[PDB]
């Protein structure tokens, strides 16, 4: 049985079904929450996560992959509770989410030591439980590929080669961080088809997106649930274009919706069209209807949400 | 009653007695410990902290100030347990320990919001307890005064003006971060005598140290318990020189000893002389004996370890 699930027995990858590849039940800074618990309400976070997951299931979602890892408040016990309340298939991961430097812990420590943490979570279990990690998550953003960012990428490659689990990335779509992640990983012997380069939906630079897809990795059109770089309308145009041009077998779509997130609220921007309701089901309300009425058939939807995740985890 | 104590009623500053102004019962990365608890042993950390505190008390230490804050694993409940086991007067603080950027939580949040966290810990209590913070801790290092580092400095000034608690800093002695911290704080209306500029013992650049002292702030010769920038022998020479030159009333001495720390072990260096045993009592075994046999009298020791802390907290 291929894929470990939180609070359940492992499943064969062929049985993953309709999958959301990048969603967060919760996201927060470990340090802030430890130091100022008065800012947080776990009961509200729990209710929000359960409600969102239930709504996803009502649209036919069978499996959710949650790439919350170190730096963003991964909590396997919170996750297992959401599973108990919903019955969702939930895939947890391991990894480190940094943009610049590692925590002081990692002073004088090797790439192998970092990889050992990942392999621990994959082979032994997460945070003292028998729930195992099913993928590795890594990140890079505006600061680019720093020394420490590269250390983490190389550690992810070691983990993949040992355990065969895939790698999901966070990138900044407006620099070449995604291309660099793919290059470094494949140089270190990672199968390109075992990599999802994240947040490429944040740009409309189609040639850059296709370049990564052509090199054999999945491309993450994965932030439909954030009011980030690109509006939903323009994301949809980019998604449609890539489908028209034959890239369905590389496309992965998700919301990157955080059922709760601890970030401060940004100044709101109002456009001619009423802002879309951001949630874990926006693609069922907006994106998928938009695609269907623009001529893309059911086989495309099945490819993106079923076949592609199956391959990724195979 | 001026100064709040962990697990005890507050004390008048005049009763603080012989004080170690900068020690850590424990230090670790919140994120690393949350994600990989298998790396840590709280029972060993507890035994180490209790043992060290007891040994300090055997040399006449009455009060320990512990500037462990966000980023370095402050845990008020661990602290209160050490107090119960030892009877030490322990002063806990609030603040943020960063060198570059704030956690993602602080995106779109103001300096006033940051200050509110500090004031919460000072006026209401720490981590859901009635133990209150008695000072603010801030940091800057090799990256210098970044945007976010400056935000935290300015928030500390607001907290001081509202609550009158002093400010302890971490600086890098080989750039001008300490001088910059002092300048920014005093510009924002902080009394220079309510600031301890930390880690100046890391350099032998006496003119730089005196410059900060002359501007009215305490100078931290405060890393006797680390095998860091400067060896103990050279620290001792610098300490003696400053005393000879009349700076006793600005000098604060401590170890910055971490009874446990989670950092990887650096490559050892062996010198002609047997390496000193690093602990929370090294100054009683090495530094203070060295000073005494070089002619500095008991009044100097009383000034540094009793009178200076009294003023700082007055
Ligand atoms: Co991301
Ligand atoms: Co320091
Ligand atoms: Fe994400
Ligand atoms: Fe320290």
Curated annotation (Swiss-Prot), chains A, B:
EC number of the protein: 3.1.8.1
Q: Where does Co(2+) bind?
A: 137, 170, 199
What is the required cofactor set for this protein? Co(2+); Fe cation
Q: Describe activity control.
A: Inactivated by EDTA and o-phenanthroline.
User: Which keywords belong to this entry?
Assistant: Cobalt, Hydrolase, Iron, Metal-binding
Which Gene Ontology molecular-function terms are recorded?
Answer: aryldialkylphosphatase activity; zinc ion binding
Q: Which Gene Ontology BP terms does the record give?
A: catabolic process
Q: How does activity depend on pH?
A: Optimum pH is 7.0-9.0.
| Entry-linked Pfam families | PTE (PF02126)
Q: Which InterPro entries match?
A: AryldialkylPase_Zn-BS, Metal_Hydrolase, Phosphotriesterase
Q: How does activity depend on temperature?
A: Thermostable.
In which residues is Fe cation bound?
A: 22, 24, 137, 256
Reactions catalysed, semicolon-separated, are: An aryl dialkyl phosphate + H2O = dialkyl phosphate + an aryl alcohol
Which enzyme type, at the first EC level? hydrolase
Return the cofactor note field: Binds 1 Co(2+) ion per subunit.
For whether the record's keyword set contains Iron, the answer is yes
CDD domains given in the database record: PTE
Q: Which PROSITE patterns match?
A: PHOSPHOTRIESTERASE_1, PHOSPHOTRIESTERASE_2
Key word Aminoacyl-tRNA synthetase present? no
Q: Could you tell me which residues carry N6-carboxylysine?
A: 137
Assembly with partners or alone: Homodimer.
UniProt lists the family membership as follows:
Belongs to the metallo-dependent hydrolases superfamily. Phosphotriesterase family.
The role this protein plays is:
Has a low paraoxonase activity. Also active, but with a lower activity, against other organo-phosphorus insecticides such as Dursban, Coumaphos, pNP-butanoate or parathion.
Q: What is this protein called?
A: Aryldialkylphosphatase
Q: What is the lineage of its organism?
A: Archaea, Thermoproteota, Thermoprotei, Sulfolobales, Sulfolobaceae
Q: Which gene encodes it?
A: php
């Amino acid at each position: 049985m291929r894929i470990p699930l939180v609070g359940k027995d492992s499943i064969e990858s062929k049985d993953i079904g309709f999958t959301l590849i990048h969603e967060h039940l919760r996201a927060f800074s470990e340090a802030v929450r430890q130091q100022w618990p008065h800012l947080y309400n776990e009961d509200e976070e729990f209710r929000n996560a359960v409600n969102e997951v239930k709504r996803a299931m009502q649209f036919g979602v069978k499996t959710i992959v949650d790439p919350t890892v170190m730096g963003c408040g991964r909590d396997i016990r919170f996750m297992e509770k959401v599973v108990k309340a919903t019955g969702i298939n939930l895939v947890a991961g391991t990894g480190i989410f940094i943009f610049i430097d590692l925590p002081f812990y990692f002073l004088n420590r090797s790439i192998d030591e970092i990889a050992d943490l990942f392999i621990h979570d994959i082979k032994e279990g997460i945070q003292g439980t028998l729930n195992k990690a099913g993928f590795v998550k890594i990140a890079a953003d505006e600061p680019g590929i720093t020394k420490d960012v590269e250390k983490v990428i190389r550690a992810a490659a070691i983990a993949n080669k040992e355990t065969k689990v895939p790698i999901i990335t966070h990138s900044n779509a407006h620099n070449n961080t995604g291309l660099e992640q793919q290059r470094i990983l494949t140089e270190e012997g990672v199968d390109p088809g075992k990599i999802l380069i994240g947040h490429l939906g944040d740009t409309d630079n189609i040639d850059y997106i296709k370049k990564i897809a052509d090199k054999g990795s999945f491309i993450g059109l994965d932030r439909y649930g954030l009011d980030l770089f690109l509006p939903v309308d323009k994301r949809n145009e980019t998604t449609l274009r890539l489908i028209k041009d034959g890239y369905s077998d590389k496309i992965m779509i998700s919301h990157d919706y955080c059922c709760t997130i601890d970030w401060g609220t940004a100044k709101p921007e109002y456009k001619p069209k009423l802002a879309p309701r951001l949630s874990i089901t926006l693609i069922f309300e907006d994106t998928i209807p938009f695609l269907k009425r623009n001529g893309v058939n059911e086989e495309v939807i099945a490819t993106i949400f079923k076949e592609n995740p199956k391959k990724f985890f195979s």
